[PDB]
Amino acid sequence: MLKAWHLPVAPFIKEQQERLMITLWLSGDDLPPRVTLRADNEELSLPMHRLRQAPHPGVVAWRGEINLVNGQPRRRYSFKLLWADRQLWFTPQEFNRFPPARLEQFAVDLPDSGPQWVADQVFYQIFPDRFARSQGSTFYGGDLDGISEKLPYLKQLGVTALYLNPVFVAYRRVDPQFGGDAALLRLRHNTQKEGMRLILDGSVVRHWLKAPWSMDGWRLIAGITQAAKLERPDAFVFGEHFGDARQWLQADVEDSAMNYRGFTFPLWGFLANTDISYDPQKIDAQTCMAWMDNYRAGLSHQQQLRMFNQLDSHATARFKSLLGKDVARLPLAVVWLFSWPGVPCIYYGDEVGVDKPFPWDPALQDGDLLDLYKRMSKLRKAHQALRYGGCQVIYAEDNVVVFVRVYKQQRVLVAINRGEACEVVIEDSPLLDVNGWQLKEGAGALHDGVLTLPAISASVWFSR
Amino acid sequence: MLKAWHLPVAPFIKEQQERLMITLWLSGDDLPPRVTLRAEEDNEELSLPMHRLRQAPHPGVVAWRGEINLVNGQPRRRYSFKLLWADRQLWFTPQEFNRFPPARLEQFAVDLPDSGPQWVADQVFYQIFPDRFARSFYGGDLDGISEKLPYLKQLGVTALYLNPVFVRRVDPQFGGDAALLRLRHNTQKEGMRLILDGSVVRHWLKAPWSMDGWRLRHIAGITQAAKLERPDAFVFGEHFGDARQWLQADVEDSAMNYRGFTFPLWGFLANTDISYDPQKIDAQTCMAWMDNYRAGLSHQQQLRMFNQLDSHATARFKSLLGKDVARLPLAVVWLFSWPGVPCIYYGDEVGVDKPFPWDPALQDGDLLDLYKRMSKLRKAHQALRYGGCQVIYAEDNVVVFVRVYKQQRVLVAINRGEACEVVIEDSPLLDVNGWQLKEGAGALHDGVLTLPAISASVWFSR
Numbered sequence: 001m002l003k004a005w006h007l008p009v010a011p012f013i014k015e016q017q018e019r020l021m022i023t024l025w026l027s028g029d030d031l032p033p034r035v036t037l038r039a040d041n042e043e044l045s046l047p048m049h050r051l052r053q054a055p056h057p058g059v060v061a062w063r064g065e066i067n068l069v070n071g072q073p074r075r076r077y078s079f080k081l082l083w084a085d086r087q088l089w090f091t092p093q094e095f096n097r098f099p100p101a102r103l104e105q106f107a108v109d110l111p112d113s114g115p116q117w118v119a120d121q122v123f124y125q126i127f128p129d130r131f132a133r134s135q136g137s138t139f140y141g142g143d144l145d146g147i148s149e150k151l152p153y154l155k156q157l158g159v160t161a162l163y164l165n166p167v168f169v170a171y172r173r174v175d176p177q178f179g180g181d182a183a184l185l186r187l188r189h190n191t192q193k194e195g196m197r198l199i200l201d202g203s204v205v206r207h208w209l210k211a212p213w214s215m216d217g218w219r220l221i222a223g224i225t226q227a228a229k230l231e232r233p234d235a236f237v238f239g240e241h242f243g244d245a246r247q248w249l250q251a252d253v254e255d256s257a258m259n260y261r262g263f264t265f266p267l268w269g270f271l272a273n274t275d276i277s278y279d280p281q282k283i284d285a286q287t288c289m290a291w292m293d294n295y296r297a298g299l300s301h302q303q304q305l306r307m308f309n310q311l312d313s314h315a316t317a318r319f320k321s322l323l324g325k326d327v328a329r330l331p332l333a334v335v336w337l338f339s340w341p342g343v344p345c346i347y348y349g350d351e352v353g354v355d356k357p358f359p360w361d362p363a364l365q366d367g368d369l370l371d372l373y374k375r376m377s378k379l380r381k382a383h384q385a386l387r388y389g390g391c392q393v394i395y396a397e398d399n400v401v402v403f404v405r406v407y408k409q410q411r412v413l414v415a416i417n418r419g420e421a422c423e424v425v426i427e428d429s430p431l432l433d434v435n436g437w438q439l440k441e442g443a444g445a446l447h448d449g450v451l452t453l454p455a456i457s458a459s460v461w462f463s464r
Numbered sequence: 465m466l467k468a469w470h471l472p473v474a475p476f477i478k479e480q481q482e483r484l485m486i487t488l489w490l491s492g493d494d495l496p497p498r499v500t501l502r503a504e505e506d507n508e509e510l511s512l513p514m515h516r517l518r519q520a521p522h523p524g525v526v527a528w529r530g531e532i533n534l535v536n537g538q539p540r541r542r543y544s545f546k547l548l549w550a551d552r553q554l555w556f557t558p559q560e561f562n563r564f565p566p567a568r569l570e571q572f573a574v575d576l577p578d579s580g581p582q583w584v585a586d587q588v589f590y591q592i593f594p595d596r597f598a599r600s601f602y603g604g605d606l607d608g609i610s611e612k613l614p615y616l617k618q619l620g621v622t623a624l625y626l627n628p629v630f631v632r633r634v635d636p637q638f639g640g641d642a643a644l645l646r647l648r649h650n651t652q653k654e655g656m657r658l659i660l661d662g663s664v665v666r667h668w669l670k671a672p673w674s675m676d677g678w679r680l681r682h683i684a685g686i687t688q689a690a691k692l693e694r695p696d697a698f699v700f701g702e703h704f705g706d707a708r709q710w711l712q713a714d715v716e717d718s719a720m721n722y723r724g725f726t727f728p729l730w731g732f733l734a735n736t737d738i739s740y741d742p743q744k745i746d747a748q749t750c751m752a753w754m755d756n757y758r759a760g761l762s763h764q765q766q767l768r769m770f771n772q773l774d775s776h777a778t779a780r781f782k783s784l785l786g787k788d789v790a791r792l793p794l795a796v797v798w799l800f801s802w803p804g805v806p807c808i809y810y811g812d813e814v815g816v817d818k819p820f821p822w823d824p825a826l827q828d829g830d831l832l833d834l835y836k837r838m839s840k841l842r843k844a845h846q847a848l849r850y851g852g853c854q855v856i857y858a859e860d861n862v863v864v865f866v867r868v869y870k871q872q873r874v875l876v877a878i879n880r881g882e883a884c885e886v887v888i889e890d891s892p893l894l895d896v897n898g899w900q901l902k903e904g905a906g907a908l909h910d911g912v913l914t915l916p917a918i919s920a921s922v923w924f925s926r
Contacts, residue, residue, distance in 0.1 A: 036739075043705050045739050086744030087737075098731075098745070098753035099723070101760075102706035243509045244568035247712065261565070269564075275553075277511055279500075282552035283564070291564035 002028035004090045005430060006079065007390030008108045008301040010408045011055075020066040020110060024048070024079050024090065025059050025430060034082040037064035040071040045080070056430035068110060074252075074300055076105040092297040103250050107300035114255050115217070115236040119305040119387050121161040121197060122338075122377050123345040124154055127314055128164065128178045130357045131348050140357050144174075144183040148190045157351060157370075158377020161197035163219065165314055172204050188214065199236065206231035222253035238308055242276060242315070246298040256306040259342060262295035263309045264316075267336060270401075271329045271418060272322040285418075289396035289403075296341070296391075305388060307342035311350065318347075320355040328456045331372055332416050335441060335458035338376035339405065339414045341391045346373065379440060383462060385410040392431055400424050400453065404431055411463035413437060415444050417453040424451045437461035466492040468556045469893060470545065471852030472572045472763040474870045475521075484532040484576060488514065488545050488556065489525050489892060498548035501530035505542040505568050514545075522892035534576055540714075540762055542571040558759035569712050573762035580717050581677070581698045585767040585849050587623040587657060588800075588839050589807040590616055593776055594626060594638045597810055602819050606634075606643035610650045619813060619832075620839025623657035627679065627776055632664060648674065659698060669694040677717075684715040700770055704738060704777070708760040718768040721804055724757035725771045726778075729798065732863075733791045733880060734784040747880075751858035751865075758803065758853075767850060769804035773812065780809075782817040790918045793834055794878055797903060797920035800838035801867065801876045803853045808835065837903060845924060847872040854893055862886050862915060866893055873925035875899065877906050879915035886913040896925040 005025035006012050014021040022037055037046040048064035055061050066075055078100050079090040089096040092106055129139055132146030147162070154162070167174055167184070174181045191198045197216040200208060205224050208215045209231040217236030218228060228235040238256040239248060245257035260276070268274050269283035269291075283291075296304055311319040311333050323329055337344045349358050351373040353366030380386045389405035389412065396402070399419035405412040411434055415424075426432070426449055437446050442459030445452040453459065469489040470476050478485045486501055501512040514530035521527050532541055544566050545556040555562040558572055595601055598608025609624070616624075624647075634641040651658045657676040660668060665686055668675045670693055677698030678690060690697040700718040701710060707719035720726075722738070730736050731743035732750035745753075758766050773781040773795050785791055799806045811820050813835040815828030842848045851869035858864070861881035867874040873896055877886075888894070888911060899908055904921025907914040915921065 036741075080741070082741055085735075085742050087741055097749045098728070098756070099706070101708065101756075103709060243505065244565075246567070247569060250709065251713075266564070273551075277500075279546070279548055279553055280551050287563045294564075294567075 002026070002030070002088070002095070004079070004081075004095070005059075005392070006090065006106065007392055007406050008106045009388070009390035009406060011406075012390075013108060015068070015110060018068040020068055020075055020108070022048075022064050022066065022077065023051075023055075024062045025055065026062065026081075027059050027430070030083070031060060032081040032083055032088075035062045035064075036080045036082065037066070037077055038080045039064075039066050039075070039077040048079075056433050059430050073111050073113065074107055074109050076102065076107045078105045093293060103246070104297045109300050109302040112302050114302055114306060115234045117197070117234060118236055118256065118343055121343050122158050122380065123161045123163050123199070123308070123343055124157070124159040124348065125163040125165060125310075125313065125345055126348050128167075128175075132358065132360070134179075139177060141177075142357075143177070143179040144187045145179050148183075148187050151190055151194050151196070154196075155194055156374070157346075158374060158381065159196065159346070161199065161216070162191060163199040163201075163345065165201040165219065167200050168202075172207070185212065188212070197236075203227055203231075209235055217255075219258075220254070221248070222251070225253055225255070236306075238306075240313075240315075244295075246295070249303055250298060256303065256308055256343075258313065258345075259295075259307040259309050262292060262307060263337075263340060263342065264311065264313075266291045267311065267333055268319075268322060271333055272319070272324070272326065274322055276316075284398050285396040285401045286398075289393045289401060292340075293393060301390065304341040304391075305343075308345050309337055309340060309342040310345040310347060311337055312347050313345075314347070318355050319350070320353060329418055330369065332418060332456065332458040334369070334372050334376060335414065335460060336416060338380050339386055339412065339460060340403075341389070341405075344376075344380070375441060379460065379462075383410065383412060384408075385412045394429060394432065395424060395426055397424075400451075402426065402451065406431060409463070413446070413461040413463075415442075415451050415453055415457075415459045415461075417444075417455070417457050419455065421455040421457075422453055424453060425449060426451055434463040436464050438464050466490070466494065466547075466554070466561070468545070468547075468561070469525075469854070469891075470556065470572065471854060471868050472574045473850070473852035473868060476852075477574060479534070479576065482533060482535045484534055484541060484574070486530050486532065486543060487517075487521075488528040489521065490528065490547075491525050491892070494549075495526060496547040496549050496554070499528045499530075500546040500548060501532070501543055502546050503530075503532045503541065503543035504537050505571065506538045506540070508537075511546070522895045525892050539575050539577055539579065540573050541576055542568065542573045544571045559755060569708070570759045573765075575762050575764040578764045579695075580764055580768060581696050583657070583696060584698055584718065584805055587805050588620050588842065589623045589625050589659075589770070589805060590619070590621040590810060591625040591627060591772075591775060591807050592810045594629065594635075596818065597820050598822075600639075601637060603637075604820075605638040606647045607639050610643075610647050613650055613654050613656070616656075617654060618836070619808070620836060620843065621656070621808070623659065623676070624651060625659045625661070625679065625807065627661040629660050630662075645672065648672075657698075663689070665689045666693040669697055679720075680716065683710065684713070687715055687717070698768075700768075702777075706757075708757070711761060711765055718765065718770055718805075720775065720807075721757075721769040721771050724754060724769060725802060725804065726773065728753045729773065729795055730781075730784060733795055734781070734786070734788065736784055738778075746860050747858040747863045748860075751855045751863060754802075755855060763852065766803045766853075767805075770807050771799055771802055771804040772807045772809065773799060774809050775807075776809075780817045781812070782815060791880055793831065794880060794918065794920045796831070796834050796838060797876065797922060798878060800842050801848060801865075801874065801922065803851075803867075806839075806842075834903075841902060841922065845872065845874060846870075847874045856891060856894070857886060857888060857913075862913075864888065864913065868893060871925070875908070875923040875925075877904070877913055877915055877919075877921045877923075879917070879919050881918065883917040884915055886915060887911055888913055898926045899923040900926050 048062040091100040134145035269281035270288040385405040385407040389407035401416040444459030514528040517527040547554040600607035731745035847867040847869035851867035863878040906921030
């Protein structure tokens with residue numbers, strides 16, 4: 001049977017001078033004697049050649065290249081496999097018998113003018129009134145100076161970036177109940193001292209990106225983003241879209257979006273049987289991964305890496321409550337939040353099991369859930385594949401999802417099981433052709449092509 | 465098994481004051497107790513409750529109705545259907561059922577109000593390369609085109625597309641600007657539209673030129689300027705690839721529908737593509753391809769898509785068919801029946817595969833009659849101009865779809881191979897008084913379609 005592999009990341013792509021080297025892996029019995037790379041402002045049919053060296057047993061590699069001197073920075077491409085009498089397309093969504101949509105090709109941004117720092121962050125979203133008062137009707141009285149005082153707690157959590165929502169009285173002034181502008185200036189100063197980024201909910205845009213405010217970005221069209229980039233070239237401008245944000249992302253009017261359609265609601269469906277309307281969902285692993293892969297396909301690799309992933313937000317119920325009787329699935333969602341492409345965003349209180357003022361008393365905190373959050377941010381800070389890697393789903397059937405993050409030689413294997421304990425046969429795969437695997441999270445077992453997965457579990461292996 | 469029908473056209477939609485009434489048809493054994501109309505989308509996704517009607521519109525069909533308030537929101541009304549059971553949900557979309565939510569830009573869509581060029585759907589276009597058409601360099605000129613306007617009227621043409629015309633200045637080898645002005649006056653007297661290939665945008669839509677449109681953010685400014693001078697200007701682009709991003713942002717009115725019509729027919733009928741790479745496309749894949757493209761377009765946009773078998777940038781379709789040239793009348797029936805406006809490339813109607821053959825002894829007379837017959841059928845039946853389109857059957861060699869408009873139905877059957885017979889499922893879209901065959905030699909009889917070899921047949925509901 002014909003198989004193919006390509007991820008818009010090393011080892012499948014490589015820049016060399018002004019040339020983007022692209023590699024396709026194939027396997028099967030009736031291999032195409034020709035493959036063309038379908039890719040300067042016009043659609044081109046670029047020739048590929050077959051390499052002499054098999055990259056993996058039973059795999060032939062084809063290589064082509066795009067000239068980067070001329071063209072828009074977003075490099076779109078797909079693979080046109082050619083036989084004597086027919087053709088087949090390879091895309092981010094497997095094979096296609098008819099041409100893929102232009103906006104559903106593989107894509108890499110070269111050169112990349114997006115905010116390079118976002119992929120390295122772990123964001124924390126704060127509703128200031130309920131987080132921390134600095135040492136009422138519905139004003140609990142927490143403020144920004146409370147946040148400053150809690151910067152050590154968040155540093156220990158793995159947090160590197162704060163997202164404040166709300167901030168302003170809604171030209172633009174910080175709410176006096178949060179400490180006013182003077183408290184915000186202190187919070188900027190203190191997060192800089194801790195190496196933490198700071199993002200505010202919203203030329204007003206340029207003013208708060210100016211010194212001495214020097215905010216790292218805005219949560220909000222293209223004119224706003226362009227003005228934001230003029231004041232601060234690495235400003236992060238992202239949108240809160242509950243629906244399909246792809247049209248905005250595909251026109252580059254925002255750097256990223258809070259990825260409800262591409263991450264949150266698929267997991268609400270697969271893990272909590274519900275959706276944004278609290279209508280019932282009966283979503284198996286096949287459908288969840290088709291959904292998530294279909295959304296991703298419209299995004300360049302760099303865009304995917306900046307997508308804002310969250311289990312819940314100021315606008316939704318807490319995910320822990322949404323799981324209801326199936327609250328044991330919550331750690332599965334935490335592993336997933338930190339291992340899927342994009343930047344994890346923790347809604348304040350999720351890490352201590354809130355389901356309402358933050359419980360600073362350690363006896364009202366779920367310490368095991370808190371430990372898991374610390375472990376995932378550590379694994380993510382230590383392994384480039386969880387921050388910069390491509391993502392390929394290996395297995396999606398009923399209760400079990402298995403995908404691998406791919407970056408240079410590094411592989412991170414993730415196995416998610418929402419149901420009873422089981423064993424799952426994983427076909428031999430050249431993406432999984434490694435020395436061995438080190439189990440670093442979870443209690444699953446990988447041995448002789450077989451995954452042994454405990455009931456209601458998530459497991460992470462790293463290639464050695 | 466669950467079945468569903470909806471086309472963004474009457475009898476499924478109907479405007480009433482400032483409300484858009486939407487109807488969904490369902491059929492099957494485990495029907496959803498609830499259905500939600502998921503609408504608006506562009507600003508504020510809304511969940512609108514639908515209720516069930518007491519009258520079955522067709523045997524075995526339950527109807528659900530909801531409504532969108534048209535007072536607020538952008539003119540493009542996007543929606544889809546969220547079928548609800550106690551434990552699960554299912555989406556109904558232009559591409560049938562989906563287990564997860566459809567893309568926002570792949571929902572049903574109607575333009576209300578429709579500010580696009582409403583006259584475009586009523587046209588039959590004729591694209592001329594002026595040097596090879598008619599002398600009054602082979603030496604053809606625009607005054608030659610004027611002299612041949614009776615011939616083009618007899619063909620059924622109602623709109624001319626000149627490519628090229630300019631050197632900007634009208635090329636002097638064609639008669640210069642004066643010959644084009646006479647062609648504008650002569651085509652206006654014949655009621656024919658005139659589109660030129662391209663600030664200069666406004667100059668040619670202004671008097672005394674008063675052209676009907678142009679062939680081309682940068683495009684958005686060009687389109688914005690054309691509409692300011694002439695609100696019914698037709699601004700469309702020549703896209704060989706996927707034009708959806710430009711159309712879904714309204715920077716152009718329409719596109720030369722290579723991705724959505726031409727190349728699917730090249731694959732299915734002529735086994736080739738724009739690169740002349742081999743194509744092995746059966747009816748299932750061709751119809752999935754063509755329907756996948758349309759789903760990214762509103763109904764009004766689809767009716768304006770520029771359909772073509774070939775053009776100045778391509779080989780003639782008659783030659784691309786090669787040994788399979790008997791399929792050419794199939795493509796002509798399809799050109800005039802698929803959603804969009806047909807564009808005839810000069811000489812296709814007389815079998816050009818090079819100066820135009822004006823000697824009736826060098827013309828394919830039978831192919832000419834078919835063009836005449838199809839343009840008369842299109843001009844006489846609104847469903848072929850304003851109707852929705854539902855693929856009924858698409859397997860291997862046979863394509864069968866229906867155009868739907870109010871009570872009118874047009875059934876089209878295409879068979880690229882040997883004579884065969886086909887079973888057509890009962891469909892509430894084909895539940896009609898009876899069928900009148902008006903083109904082709906197919907036969908419909910008690911659920912059986914008998915399709916002659918390499919043929920296309922058109923029936924009309926009576």
